[PDB]
Design a protein around this nucleic acid. Structure first.
Ligand SMILES: [Mg+2]
Ligand SMILES: [Mg+2]
Ligand SMILES: [Mg+2]
Length: 90
RNA sequence: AAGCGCCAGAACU
RNA sequence: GGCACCAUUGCACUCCGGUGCCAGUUGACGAGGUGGGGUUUAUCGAGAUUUCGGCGGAUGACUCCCGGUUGUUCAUCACAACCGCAAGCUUUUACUUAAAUCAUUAAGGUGACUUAGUGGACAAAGGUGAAAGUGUGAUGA
């Protein structure tokens, strides 16, 4: 069910990797400390983010609050990650 | 201190 | 990389779906070379991914020209090779710091890459000394 890492989609695909990476860090910093934000632009991974929190407590509040939030003209879609990330697992 | 200087093809961001 | 257009709403942790376009970055490593006029695809090695491809520069080669060596001192003249601040040809000999690639580890980059440093080597042609070997003729002292 719940996870340290959160899965975000429906992101604006037109925005470049690092700009998107640093703009997500601008909002999700309040919920807790972020370990890393993983963004790709490939066919299968575009418009998708993976914010890695240190506390699940933070990832829940981030999921609760930032659901449906218009980010770059497009509302966000947040779930928990299906499995734990490498930095969390190891 | 002239194999030296620029950069339509090409290739790699 | 970045603007668009088409496609994609997708659960990852070594990048990477197209085409059109406007910007990037790479695009020669060092030795050696200039009397004027033409003609032309301009010498020498090192590396190996492109130092490929197209474009200009140029001190190259061949040649005409003027100028001058060498062929036994010197003008005039044929010649024969040469040279443009050097100069017949042959052969050895001594100089003429090769750098890059490689390895490496920084620094600056979103990045392709960039600049710089360290260690370790290895050229070829040409030029310049030196030592033999060794190359003309008329007409004047
Ligand atoms: Mg060079
Ligand atoms: Mg040079
Ligand atoms: Mg090869």
């Amino acid at each position: 069910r719940p996870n340290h890492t959160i899965y975000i989609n429906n992101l604006n695909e037109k925005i470049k990797k690092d700009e998107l990476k640093k703009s997500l860090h601008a909002i999700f910093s309040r919920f807790g400390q972020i370990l890393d934000i993983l963004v790709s632009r490939s066919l299968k991974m575009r418009g998708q983010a993976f914010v890695i929190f240190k506390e699940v407590s933070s990832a829940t509040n981030a999921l609760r609050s930032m659901q449906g939030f218009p980010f770059y003209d497009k509302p966000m879609r947040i779930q928990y990650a299906k499995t734990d990330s490498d930095i969390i697992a190891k």
